[PDB]
Design a protein around this ligand. Structure first.
Ligand SMILES: Nc1ncnc2c1ncn2[C@@H]1O[C@H](COP(=O)(O)OP(=O)(O)O)[C@@H](O)[C@H]1O
Ligand SMILES: Nc1ncnc2c1ncn2[C@@H]1O[C@H](COP(=O)(O)OP(=O)(O)O)[C@@H](O)[C@H]1O
Ligand SMILES: [Mg+2]
Ligand SMILES: [Mg+2]
Ligand SMILES: [Zn+2]
Lengths: 344, 654
């Protein structure tokens, strides 16, 4: 079911009220995303927030600020990025899945063709137009061509695609979120090189993501035992092993997210003071790290906007009309977690 | 009493109510009779078309139903309205006994043009039950066919006695006589049609790129066909942004030119009755580019106005606002209030909007005051919001990207029309923007092939074509506003400018201003920016000494129209001195943007723009000084080393 067609009613309301009554909505929803994958909890929280989204703001004079959150995963081989991409694409009601050079050119964007039924010309949307108001999943993000990268750049920028070619001069609507996956330039990550030298994408493009995760594979005799137990149990039976926790099926998740999307929390004054203080501290800290050539990118106003969007998303998920300090706490907590792999 | 079959309209009730509304209605200047004076002015000037704001009808109590009648049955109501207007006119002229010369008004024609029909949901959201209703649209003109002769009266001749007849068209059908109407001659089927003796009307078809306000999920842009008749032909040009009111129609189409078989699925279009070409959210068109079109409008007796009207109070307010001593800062601060500081960037944007003065040499020769700006700097600054705002404020322009364009896609091409099945010529991005501003994003990703065509546009404001079937030179009087990102991750201040931007050094000298948007970490500025940005979420709707956008556009349009500065010797001395200074200063190569004659041209243009602002007609020393200061500050030579071409992060002020 689409989110726009939502409506409260006794049947849906009873299920929703049960869900809130059960308590622990945040983690319970987070842990239900691809429950066959062990570990990877904070990535799942970020993915859930990408599902929920933030608040879109009309500032006046025609100006526009997005409310959609973009997330990028990048890690070593065999860490199950593709499984998470596919699961997210399957949960979303308007999700689309793409992988590298299989989709290119007019596969993205749109092309000119003639309607058989009617005698008029039209435009057929590609991957980016088919997932409008949805999630667009891109696999093998680093192996793409320059034109596709530019199109994604513009789409993340301002939710539109401009085309000026023979027989076409128009602007498309791209109100969609991006979920990308990538690999290091030399296969595994090389801790002897600068972070910006381990990846093929431009630094600005990486900076254009609200959350950028690093997932490395450091062998450890302990956690390997748990991962192997989980995987081999999953192969023996058809279910996940935990018994004290029950996963919520996709329909109920979709219903709750549809209900949550109708909210529009607002900023108070104390939260704004906290946000400005945190932004100043983080911006001051990041410059020293980036001078030592040990930062994927220096903090910029986009980091503050991402923090605001994540706080709004958490407030919406809590089903509240106002934001609190704990939401900004969790947003900063996640944005810090984004990069422990680079400090071991 | 006596309604019309199919409708609920009663002619008597409608005419009485329309007369009463005409003779008693005020704008509540708001206490006087609004339409009596408009009719009086019409007759004094002799105009024949009355523009009726359909929203004015919902105010009066009587016509609360005539509004829905007009929205549902425009065909009958418009004719009733026209006849009632003529009757009210004769009553007004005769009831006061002004002048006994009333034959002309009794012989001529009148008409009413509704122009404020309610808000719609987009063309593609209409259903079959909405056929033959009143609607409105927004869009961009793409193409227009030549005038089509449309017969109204047919001229027959008898091939035995020269007797000639005249038959008037009836709902699109001609009844050819089957016998001569003479008594001496009664030969059957002897009448022949002489086409050149017939009377024809005017017709045209326009292709429109619709821009609906609400867009459903996954909907791509499409095009629509518009039909204009009589005096409204040739009133639109490709690239114009317009608002249109018309009727929603349908029609069947023949399957082939041989048989007379029709197709069950119908073709939809719109019949136009009024076109609005002005807005309060953008500047007026540059009148220096439509010189002959205004003359043709006057010749053609079409009452479409290209420029907005000005009241005396508005001009007085304009003068008072121009009379204050903070005008420059106020005007700069007005631009994009949602963008913090960037004083010099906003000053450059304002000067570009104002523009320089256009010289036109007798015996041939053209200079133009278009101003080109390039924005280079750190990726995360607010240099794309600027492009969006300037695109939405300007009257014409296309927003393009370097990597998503092509040389053909920017200039011209040939396509096959899906209706007429023939080949036609269309316009590219740079010609659609003539008279406006073309915004190019990520200018450093554009291919050399694609970039090749910008040289002629920026060096003569024209383009030449040598392709199969077409050989001509086109006008490209459009300003360029570009942006670029540095090579690598961040602008490295330990390297020259030419090592940070991925463009040939010679290309960077053709712009009028070059901006280095640098990001520096200072806690005070961080606090200010964070507070500014976090104040925008305090309440669900915006509430942010700033002029309103409407007044700003009115002021800039008036200044562009009515002021034409001229340079003096006092400015000539300073211009030559400053140019020689720039050439000498800095005199082991490719370390800095070398000065050229383009720099002197840029100073001339910027000084003319500064003079044109604030309603001055003479360029003086202060103008040139400000122009030089702005040029120097944009590239921030104050923090640059003349020898090595590096930058000091401590000498740059936020
Ligand atoms: N944490 C994990 N839990 C369960 N299975 C995993 C995990 N990590 C990897 N796998 C398994 O290894 C394979 C990894 O392939 P893929 O999904 O393409 O991820 P990647 O593209 O990162 O290698 C998958 O088939 C998956 O079943
Ligand atoms: N001076 C400023 N005023 C207002 N917003 C700013 C400013 N600087 C940065 N921002 C914020 O940071 C973002 C800048 O991104 P954007 O302008 O799209 O990048 P660029 O234009 O450099 O490609 C915007 O979303 C904006 O809200
Ligand atoms: Mg994979
Ligand atoms: Mg931008
Ligand atoms: Zn005869």
């Amino acid at each position: 079911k689409k989110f726009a067609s939502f409506s409260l009613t006794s049947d849906v309301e009873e299920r929703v009220m049960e869900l809130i009554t059960s308590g622990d909505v945040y983690n319970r929803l987070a842990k239900s995303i691809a429950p066959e994958i062990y570990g990877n909890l904070d990535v799942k929280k970020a993915l859930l927030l990408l599902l929920v989204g933030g608040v879109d703001k009309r500032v006046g004079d025609g100006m526009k600020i997005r409310g959609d959150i973009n997330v990028c995963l990048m890690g070593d081989p065999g860490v199950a990025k593709s499984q998470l991409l596919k699961a997210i694409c399957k949960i979303s009601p308007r999700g689309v899945y793409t992988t590298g050079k299989g989709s290119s050119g007019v596969g993205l964007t749109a092309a000119v063709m003639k309607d058989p039924v009617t005698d008029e010309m039209i435009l057929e949307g590609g991957a980016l137009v088919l997932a409008d108001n949805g999630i667009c999943c891109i696999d093998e993000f680093d192996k793409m061509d320059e034109s596709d990268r530019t199109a994604i750049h513009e789409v993340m920028e301002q939710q539109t695609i401009s085309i000026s070619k023979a027989g076409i001069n128009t602007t498309l609507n791209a109100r969609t979120s991006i979920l990308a996956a990538a690999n290091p330039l030399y296969g595994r990550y090389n801790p002897r090189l600068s972070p910006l030298d381990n990846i093929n994408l431009p630094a600005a493009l990486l900076s254009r993501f609200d959350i950028l995760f690093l997932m490395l594979d450091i062998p450890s005799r302990d956690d390997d035992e748990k991962l192997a137990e989980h995987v081999t149990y999953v192969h023996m039976h058809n279910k996940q092993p935990d018994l004290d926790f029950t996963p919520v099926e996709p329909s109920k998740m979709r219903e709750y997210i549809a209900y949550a999307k109708t909210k529009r929390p607002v900023m108070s004054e104390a939260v704004n003071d906290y946000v400005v203080q945190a932004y100043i501290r983080l911006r001051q800290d990041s410059k020293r790290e980036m001078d030592s050539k040990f930062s994927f990118g220096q903090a910029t106003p986009r980091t503050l906007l991402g923090i605001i969007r994540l706080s709004q998303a958490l407030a919406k998920l809590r089903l509240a009309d106002m934001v609190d300090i704990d939401d900004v706490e969790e947003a900063l907590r996640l944005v810090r977690v984004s990069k422990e792999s680079l400090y071991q | 009493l006596r309604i019309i079959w199919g409708t609920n309209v009663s002619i008597q009730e409608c005419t009485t109510n329309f007369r009463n509304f005409l003779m008693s209605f005020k704008y509540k200047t708001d206490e006087e009779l609004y339409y009596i004076k408009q009719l009086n002015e019409m007759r004094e000037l002799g105009t024949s078309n009355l523009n009726l704001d359909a929203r004015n009808l919902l105010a009066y109590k009587q016509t609360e139903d005539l509004y829905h009648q007009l929205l549902n049955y425009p065909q009958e109501v418009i004719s009733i309205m026209d006849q009632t207007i003529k009757d009210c006119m004769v009553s007004l002229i005769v009831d006061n006994n002004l002048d006994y010369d009333l034959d002309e008004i009794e012989t001529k024609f009148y008409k009413v043009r509704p122009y404020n029909v309610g808000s719609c949901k987009g063309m593609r959201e209409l259903n079959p039950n909405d056929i033959d209703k009143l609607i409105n649209l927004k869009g961009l003109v793409l193409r227009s066919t030549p005038v089509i002769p449309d017969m109204k009266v047919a001229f027959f001749k008898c091939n035995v006695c020269d007797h000639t007849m005249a038959v008037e068209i009836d709902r699109g059908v001609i009844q050819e006589p089957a016998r001569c109407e003479r008594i001496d001659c009664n030969e059957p089927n002897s009448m022949s049609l002489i086409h050149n003796r017939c009377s024809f009307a005017d017709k045209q078809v326009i292709k429109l790129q619709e821009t609906p306000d609400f867009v459903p999920d996954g909907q791509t842009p499409h095009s629509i066909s518009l039909c204009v008749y009589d005096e409204l032909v040739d009133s639109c040009r490709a690239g114009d942004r317009i608002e249109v009111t018309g009727t929603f129609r349908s029609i069947p189409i023949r399957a082939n030119s041989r048989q007379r078989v029709l197709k069950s699925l119908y073709k939809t279009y719109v019949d136009v009755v009024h076109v609005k070409k002005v807005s309060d959210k953008r500047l007026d068109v540059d009148t220096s580019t439509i010189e002959q079109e205004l003359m043709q409008n006057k010749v053609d007796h079409n009452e479409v106005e290209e420029v907005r009207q000005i009241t005396d109070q508005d001009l007085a307010k304009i003068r008072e606002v121009a009379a204050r001593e903070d005008l420059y800062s106020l005007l700069a601060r007005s631009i994009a209030p949602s963008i913090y500081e960037l004083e010099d960037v906003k000053k450059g944007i304002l000067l570009q909007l104002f523009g320089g003065t256009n010289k036109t040499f007798t015996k041939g020769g053209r200079y133009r005051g278009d101003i080109n700006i390039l924005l280079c700097g750190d990726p995360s600054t607010s240099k794309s919001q600027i492009l969006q705002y300037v695109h939405k404020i300007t009257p014409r322009g296309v927003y393009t990207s370097g990597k998503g364009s092509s040389a053909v896609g920017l200039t011209a091409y040939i396509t096959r029309d899906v209706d007429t099945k023939q080949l036609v010529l269309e316009s590219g991005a740079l010609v659609l923007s003539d008279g406006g501003v073309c915004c190019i994003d990520e200018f450093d990703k554009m291919s050399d092939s694609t970039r090749s065509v910008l040289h002629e546009v920026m060096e003569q404001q024209t383009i030449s074509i040598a392709k199969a079937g077409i050989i001509t030179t086109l006008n490209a009087r459009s300003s360029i506003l570009a942006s670029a990102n540095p090579i690598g991750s961040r602008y490295n201040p330990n390297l020259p400018v030419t090592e940070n931007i991925d463009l040939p050094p010679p290309l960077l000298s053709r712009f009028d201003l070059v901006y280095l948007v640098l990001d520096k970490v200072d806690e005070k500025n961080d606090r200010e920016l964070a507070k500014h940005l976090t104040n925008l979420y305090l309440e669900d709707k915006p509430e942010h000494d700033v002029l309103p956008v409407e007044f700003l556009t009115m002021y800039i349009s008036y200044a562009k129209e009515h002021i034409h500065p001229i340079i003096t010797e006092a400015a000539k001395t300073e211009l030559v001195r400053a140019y020689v200074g720039m050439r000498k200063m800095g005199d082991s190569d490719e370390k800095r943007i070398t000065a050229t004659t383009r720099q002197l041209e840029s100073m001339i243009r910027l000084a003319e723009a500064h003079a044109k602002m604030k309603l001055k007609n003479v360029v003086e020393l202060e103008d040139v000084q400000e122009a030089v200061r702005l040029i120097r500050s944009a590239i921030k030579d104050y923090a640059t080393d003349p020898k090595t071409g590096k930058i000091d992060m401590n000498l740059v002020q936020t």
